[PDB]
Amino acid sequence: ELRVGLEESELWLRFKELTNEMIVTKNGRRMFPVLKVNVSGLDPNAMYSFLLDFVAADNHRWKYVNGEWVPGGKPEPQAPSCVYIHPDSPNFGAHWMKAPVSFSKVKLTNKLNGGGQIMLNSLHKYEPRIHIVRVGGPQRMITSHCFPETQFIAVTAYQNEEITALKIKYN
Ligand SMILES: Cc1nc(CC(=O)N2CCOCC2)cs1
């Protein structure tokens, strides 16, 4: 059985208990913490691409009111985010299972951009998601996995100083 696990859930959980925030910029900003995933039960000889996208966790815009995050009243449909391809892709099952798969180079932006960067809607809450795509075989297959622990609100600057402090403490 193909097993997907979050590396450093310990640390992600400290961020989640405060409501995590991730900065988005015109040119794109790298994530901290970085999403790192442990995968077992791949065919070491089969070929795979690792894909990352972000699900809008609810249909609302969020605002930091009186030191607390609160959702707007006016939900809108949240279109699916674009997918980021892990730059090691495509690669053998053995490659992926030999060390945690680290999405260290994805950049989150608030603007439609050339390439690479993933555009998110500021003040929307997101749940990171990966897709493991078996490629090069005749039989294409996709396994998807969500990481609730890694939820965050996309922000142009930090609202909760407790997040600012944690970001610096563990970087
Ligand atoms: C808005 C959406 N677009 C997609 C596809 C996508 O972004 N890809 C870029 C990198 O891999 C190839 C396809 C899924 S939802």
UniProtKB/Swiss-Prot annotation:
Q: Which residues bind DNA?
A: 11-171
Q: What does the record say mutating residue 116 to C does? A: In NTD; uncertain significance
Question: Where does it localize?
Answer: Nucleus
- Its domain of life? Eukaryota
Please give the annotated consequence of changing residue 131 to R: In SAVA; reduced DNA binding activity; increased cell growth; altered expression of genes involved in ossification and notochord maintenance
The entry's note on the tissues where this protein occurs is: Detected in testis, but not in other, normal tissues. Detected in lung tumors (at protein level).
Its job: Involved in the transcriptional regulation of genes required for mesoderm formation and differentiation. Binds to a palindromic T site 5'-TTCACACCTAGGTGTGAA-3' DNA sequence and activates gene transcription when bound to such a site.
Assembly description: Monomer.
**Illness association:** Neural tube defects: Congenital malformations of the central nervous system and adjacent structures related to defective neural tube closure during the first trimester of pregnancy. Failure of neural tube closure can occur at any level of the embryonic axis. Common NTD forms include anencephaly, myelomeningocele and spina bifida, which result from the failure of fusion in the cranial and spinal region of the neural tube. NTDs have a multifactorial etiology encompassing both genetic and environmental components.
This chain belongs to the protein called: T-box transcription factor T
Q: Which residues of the full protein are shown?
A: 41 to 211 of 435
